[PDB]
From a paper:
However, in the presence of [name]ɣS, we were able to grow and collect 2.95 Å diffraction data for a crystal of a further truncated G. thermoleovorans NocNΔ26ΔCTD variant, which lacks both the N-terminal membrane-targeting helix and the C-terminal domain. After solving its structure, it was apparent that NocNΔ26ΔCTD had adopted an alternative conformation to that of [name]ΔCTD. However, there was no clear electron density for a bound nucleotide in our structure; instead a sulfate anion from the crystallization solution occupies a position equivalent to that of the β-phosphate of the nucleotide in the B. subtilis ParBΔCTD-CDP structure (Soh et al., 2019). We further observed that helix α5 in the [name]ΔN26ΔCTD structure swings outward by 104° and no longer forms a bundle with helix α6 from the same subunit and that this movement might drive the self-dimerization at the NTD of [name] (i.e., the NTD engagement). By superimposing the NTDs of [name]ΔCTD and NocNΔ26ΔCTD (RMSD = 1.49 Å), we detected severe clashes between α1, α2, and the opposite subunit of NocNΔ26ΔCTD. Therefore, it is clear that the autoinhibitory state of α1 and α2 (as observed in [name]ΔCTD) is not compatible with the alternative conformation in the NocNΔ26ΔCTD structure. The lack of a bound nucleotide in the NocNΔ26ΔCTD structure prevents us from drawing a conclusion on the role of [name] and the possible conformational liberation of the amphipathic helix α1. However, several lines of evidence suggest that [name] might favor the NTD-engagement conformation as observed in our NocNΔ26ΔCTD structure: (1) [name]/[name]ɣS promoted the crosslinking between symmetrical E29C residues, a readout for NTD engagement; (2) the conformation of NocNΔ26ΔCTD is highly similar to that of a nucleotide-bound B. subtilis ParB (Soh et al., 2019); and (3) [name]/[name]ɣS enables [name] (WT) to co-sediment with liposomes.
Here, we report that a [name] [name] is a CTPase enzyme whose membrane-binding activity is directly regulated by a [name] switch. In Bacillus subtilis, [name] nucleates on 16 bp NBS sites before associating with neighboring non-specific DNA to form large membrane-associated nucleoprotein complexes to physically occlude assembly of the cell division machinery. Unusually, [name] is also a peripheral membrane protein that directly associates with the cell membrane via a predicted N-terminal amphipathic helix (Adams et al., 2015). We provide evidence that (1) [name] is required for [name] to form the NBS-dependent nucleoprotein complex, and (2) [name] binding switches [name] from a membrane-inactive auto-repressed state to a membrane-active state.
Author numbering:
A (entry chain A), B (entry chain A): 26 to 224
The structure:
């Protein structure tokens, strides 16, 4: 019903920790993205007790704003028993789907058009490397079938990166079918990619 | 400030689509998980115009509730220009971190303890297969170092699954170092795993 502003310092992460490993590279991108357009989704908490709140969902948002130095955060309070909290806390983390590398690439291109930005401008805004931005956009040059493999998560982005060098659609497609069917890794893809350019 | 209830049928997904591929397997797990404990995080929308709302963030929530047959959904309305919406819409999707397979496993074990449930009970509640639940929990039996590799995303869950069969900690660890350093795939791991049990 009501979005609430709650003290960042009075918040304790969920006892049944759903997340054990936390990438600071990513969490900083979040703190940066929150500096620009603020916290878009409030953090879900329950009252742990008197004036203290247990995070249901939104640890990264909490840690990013902590780094930002914000004194309070937007929350939604839901009355829940200790069992409900732990369950929900695990489901909101189990039911997360990350965007596919091709889509991450597509999005990067959208922001390049919309904010009329350089690959350096993008890296600075999204809190990642010029390298990572450039290399992911390069995947849009790949043949469409390879691009569809990327979304179907048939191939990794590193498998595809090597295929960019072949510079022949047919050769790339022939290898793609080998990679998925033979189930090649990144190493033996790169290996095979070089052998072809040599020959 | 105020969480709002808005008509599911008056909502249009973002024009600059951040997500192109949508796994129904997952989206159904979400609709199921929403049947049980409801929509925990309201969906962020802007007013596209008169009585119509453009999704900023929460397409999966929207599609899951649509399948559930819900007539309205909880939203947060933010006034934004067409440029702001598109940008934010891409960032809320770019800054998503999925849980690591070991953590997905750990969470599954928590719910098994908390709801005192069978692997079948878990599969039914989380909307996935008994197989997927069983196979992911089996990773908790693996040696700790392998488990740390899993969180560091050094190895895939399929690389690890094969190592469960070796049933010797040392042999598993020796292979682990080979997998990461030699950069072996799932195929050549399984291959090597069998060769050892044969010999």
């Amino acid at each position: 019903e009501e979005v609430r502003h709650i003290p960042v310092k009075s918040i304790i992460p969920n006892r049944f920790q759903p997340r054990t490993m936390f990438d600071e590279e990513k969490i900083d991108e979040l703190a940066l993205t929150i500096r620009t357009h603020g916290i878009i989704q409030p953090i879900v908490v329950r009252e742990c007790g008197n004036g203290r709140f247990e995070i249901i969902a939104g640890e990264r948002r909490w840690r990013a704003v902590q780094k930002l130095g914000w004194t309070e955060i937007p929350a939604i309070i839901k009355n829940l028993n200790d069992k409900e909290t732990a369950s929900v806390a695990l489901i909101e983390n189990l039911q997360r789907e990350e965007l596919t590398p091709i889509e991450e690439a597509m999005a990067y291109a959208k922001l390049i058009e919309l904010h009329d930005l350089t690959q350096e401008a993008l890296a600075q805004r999204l809190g990642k490397g010029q390298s990572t931005i450039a290399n992911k956009l390069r995947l849009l040059k790949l043949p469409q079938e390879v691009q569809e493999a990327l979304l179907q998560r048939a191939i990794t982005e590193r498998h595809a990166r090597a295929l960019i060098a072949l510079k022949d659609k047919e050769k790339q497609l022939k290898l793609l079918q080998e990679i998925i069917d033979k189930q090649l890794n990144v190493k033996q893809t790169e290996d095979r990619v070089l052998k072809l350019l040599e020959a």
